[PDB]
Amino acid sequence: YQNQRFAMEPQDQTAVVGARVTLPCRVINKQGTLQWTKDDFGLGTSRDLSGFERYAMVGSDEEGDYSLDIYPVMLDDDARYQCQVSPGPEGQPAIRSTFAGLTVLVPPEAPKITQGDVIYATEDRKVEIECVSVGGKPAAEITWIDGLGNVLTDNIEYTVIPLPDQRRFTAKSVLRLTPKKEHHNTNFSCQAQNTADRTYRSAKIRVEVKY
């Protein structure tokens, strides 16, 4: 009845690198010691959380509020969190909150076309144009457009390559082009965007054609 219990428990959240994120935890009739774990690692029991320079427990003691405040968010924060309270002095039972997953989003590097600024093609001599978006979490989507902003979906092969950290991804989109004679000095552009991006980013290449 009077045993310590949660008024609020953390829920899954998603946040971009550099952002602030606060995982809620509030206790009614708090009796034991409160602590957050991160992937089952105890973060510590004092509000300043020494050892973790970007973490602190904020809120007032009177309200039982020990929310885990993270700023700035970094990729290393992508993990499972839990709010815990140890048993009370009279044996009031320990309590453990719902686990809360923090998903951290990472904007990719600027998209780049491997072939550079200009490609010198020959009519009917098939050629590859590769757009690359390095290190996004999640992988960036890539759209191709022609000289007039018409989206292409033909002759395009999109692939994803995980980075060694197994969290970030490099996205690649290959446009296989059969250079028509009219294609001379036309442009092709790729547009890359992941869910961390505020809008898409673009790269462009000019195509020259002989014959």
Residues found near a second copy in the complex (CB under 8 A): 32-33, 35, 37, 40-45, 50-52, 82, 84, 86-89, 94, 96
Q: Given the rule CB under 5 A, which of 49-57, 69-77, 169-177, 183-191 is the region that contacts Na ion? A: 49-57
Find which of a second copy, Na ion, none residue 87 binds, CB within 5 to 8 Å per kind: a second copy
C-alpha to C-alpha distance for 106 and 146, rounded to whole angstroms: 28
Residue 33 C-beta: closest distance to a second copy, Å = 6
Closer by beta carbon to Na ion, 51 or else 164: 51
Helix, strand, coil shares of the chain as percentages rounded to 5?
5, 50, 45
Tokens of 134: 């390095």
Smallest gap from residue 107 Cβ to a second copy (A): 25
Compute CA distances 178 → 29, 123, 133, 204, whole Å.
Answer: 72, 7, 24, 18
- Peptide bond connecting 179 to the previous residue in cis, omega within 30 degrees of 0: no
> In angstroms, what is the minimal distance from the CB of 10 to a second copy?
16
* The only residue of 15, 25, 34, 49 in contact with Na ion, by rule CB under 5 A: 49
CA dist 33 and 62 (Å) reads: 14
By the criterion CB under 5 A, which residues form the site for Na ion? 49, 52, 55-56
